[PDB]
Amino acid sequence: STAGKVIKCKAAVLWEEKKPFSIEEVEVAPPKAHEVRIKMVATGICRSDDHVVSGTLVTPLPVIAGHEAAGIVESIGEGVTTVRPGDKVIPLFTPQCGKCRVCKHPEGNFCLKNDLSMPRGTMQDGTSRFTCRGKPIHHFLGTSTFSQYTVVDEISVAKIDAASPLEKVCLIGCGFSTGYGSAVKVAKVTQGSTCAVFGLGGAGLSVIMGCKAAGAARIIGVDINKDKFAKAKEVGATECVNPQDYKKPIQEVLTEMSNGGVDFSFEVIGRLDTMVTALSCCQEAYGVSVIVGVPPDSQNLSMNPMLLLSGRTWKGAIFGGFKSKDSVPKLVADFMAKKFALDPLITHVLPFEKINEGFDLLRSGESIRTILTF
Amino acid sequence: STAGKVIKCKAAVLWEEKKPFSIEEVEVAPPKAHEVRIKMVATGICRSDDHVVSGTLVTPLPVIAGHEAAGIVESIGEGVTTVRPGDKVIPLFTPQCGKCRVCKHPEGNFCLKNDLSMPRGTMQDGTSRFTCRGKPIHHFLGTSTFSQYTVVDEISVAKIDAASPLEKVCLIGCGFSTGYGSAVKVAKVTQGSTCAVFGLGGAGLSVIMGCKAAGAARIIGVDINKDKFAKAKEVGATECVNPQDYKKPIQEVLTEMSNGGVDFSFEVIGRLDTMVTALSCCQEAYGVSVIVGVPPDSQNLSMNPMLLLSGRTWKGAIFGGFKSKDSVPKLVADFMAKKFALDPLITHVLPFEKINEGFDLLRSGESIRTILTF
Ligand SMILES: NC(=O)c1ccc[n+]([C@@H]2O[C@H](COP(=O)([O-])OP(=O)([O-])OC[C@H]3O[C@@H](n4cnc5c(N)[nH+]cnc54)[C@H](O)[C@@H]3O)[C@@H](O)[C@H]2O)c1
Ligand SMILES: NC(=O)c1ccc[n+]([C@@H]2O[C@H](COP(=O)([O-])OP(=O)([O-])OC[C@H]3O[C@@H](n4cnc5c(N)[nH+]cnc54)[C@H](O)[C@@H]3O)[C@@H](O)[C@H]2O)c1
Ligand SMILES: [Zn+2]
Ligand SMILES: [Zn+2]
């Protein structure tokens, strides 16, 4: 039995920025009250994890990163009522405490208990459950999924269907839900509309999926890497454009293509310039632009507010606007009912031990999602 | 006896930036096809008119400014079907052509025939109906209401109730409708919400009116001129704050006052900094901020897109989001039925000949709206 005991297990530790993960033994403390210890089954390599490595996203180091995953509960702390040992679960990088003003709001999802705004890299109690070589190791977004075992707060975990294929549904923990919700919930894409999606990685493909599910008539994918175009078309893009192919700025090209601007645009990259371009390519009087990409730490963009005065709406969201704990189980049920597909996102499957090779695939442009299996 | 003939009348001509208007004779051509010549009865002095003087809002000079007004049709050009001689009318600084993609869209109001995005200072046919000292004079926003007579395109005029009091209802042509619609239509303020309104001039008071009409529980007025606070409270502000009274930045103050950010904020000034402050003070996950103020020409703001990524919505609008020709007559009818008040906005009355005094009143801080009578 492991319950109540420290577990020694394998994890991928990031000791400092811009270095490979170190795959080595860590100690995972047992869960305290209202905490849940999970044996990981599969975890995705999301660009946001790479942002931790690159310094784009600041969070305390050393750290166990990873936030898109699925696993099986090993044990529960005192007071846990929402999961039990043996349950399949998805950790929630945006928590749902159910008590804060955001949780209580019909349209809010960015729960005040999140560890994204002002990252501390701990459990909710301000402490860590991880040690490595005698040193405390930070958590990441209350999840820390690049480990054979993690400990999360109850507010940061959802129970899912016992029959779920964990090596696919982990993607509901981040990339699928983010992109899909950004289209269907945050933008509220309408039937017959024209959409433009900047960035055709895992999140941008999931935006396309949502735009298509919402009935868009035209979905224009934009990427500088033309190798991304075939899969974008497969999941619903009606046309793809590479900014590098054009003498004019791509906002001008997209405005022309759409006979005066798109209905809905999405920035799914994380660059300041593309955020402004994406805003500008939506129709000036009634267009809506949604920022999904994570910007480089502490940098501001510059823009002319006449873009908004004319009538545009600009918004952003975390996790597709989904209230995480309510939504994740429903999304998994929807997947099991064949309401959407996840296979188009998965290009590589590797053992956990090959995490660095998985990150190399992302960085080279060669993958959409690598799933790591424990 | 004037139909088909040039009218000589007095107008207020702006020959140069940063100078008084010149009250002098102009020649007003008869209306061509689908144009309407109007005998002006009352016009308001809007800060946007002052923007023309100051070079905040760039439009070609020399110019006849004025865009908030009401009058009586003197004559109609060939093919005009929507007004007749003797009708009371409000010129529409935002046209409603009824045919463009914006006019056809359920939400859109910034008709593509507008002269605001790229001002040319002409009629729709690219010519002027005004001569002064033998020289052609530009139009402003297709209205040019600082004249005893003006000529507008049919898409830029609405027929209003024959029993309307023109010295009141002119304010439906800009300041009232802009602010009220910004709250009720663009922001969609909800019952029980907390709103913050930056700038307590005519447009900002009209925003407060709309927030109260929508049932907001708290309406926090923000102005650096504390003389503005008494009227703001009369029309519905629950509290007023002067940024100059505080050591901390006002976005921090407002976040604290609202126990974590306001539901709806409005920038009703025209400053880059207050546009970003107003965004920042709305709740980071579900807040909405609406830009109403007109920015200084060609200047860009700087902001951190993490303000949006957390979930905020940022939008702007012209004319409160109202489709102008549909909406103006309805607003007049509602006013006649006492559904809203205009007198709180009217602080001074002058004859047209005292236009420069009226601008002096606005610039000193003393007035909300001066109404000029012809
Ligand atoms: N808001 C959230 O909750 C959330 C969740 C998931 C991902 N993200 C962010 O979303 C972004 C995309 O993530 P992903 O899809 O996993 O990453 P990804 O697989 O790296 O995809 C990004 C795509 O952008 C393309 N690209 C790079 N530069 C440009 C350019 N200048 N113009 C056009 N295309 C360009 C690039 O070729 C690639 O296909 C990242 O910044 C993530 O951090 C945010
Ligand atoms: N979007 C539209 O369709 C539209 C229509 C009407 C008015 N406008 C604009 O809206 C703005 C307000 O117009 P208005 O109400 O007629 O003008 P106004 O009477 O000049 O009111 C502006 C108010 O802002 C106050 N103010 C100035 N600087 C600051 C500051 N730093 N912080 C807080 N308060 C400050 C000032 O004291 C004044 O009471 C102007 O820029 C107009 O051009 C836009
Ligand atoms: Zn919460
Ligand atoms: Zn992610």
Ligand SMILES: [Zn+2]
């Ligand atoms: Zn139109």
Ligand SMILES: [Zn+2]
């Ligand atoms: Zn105005």
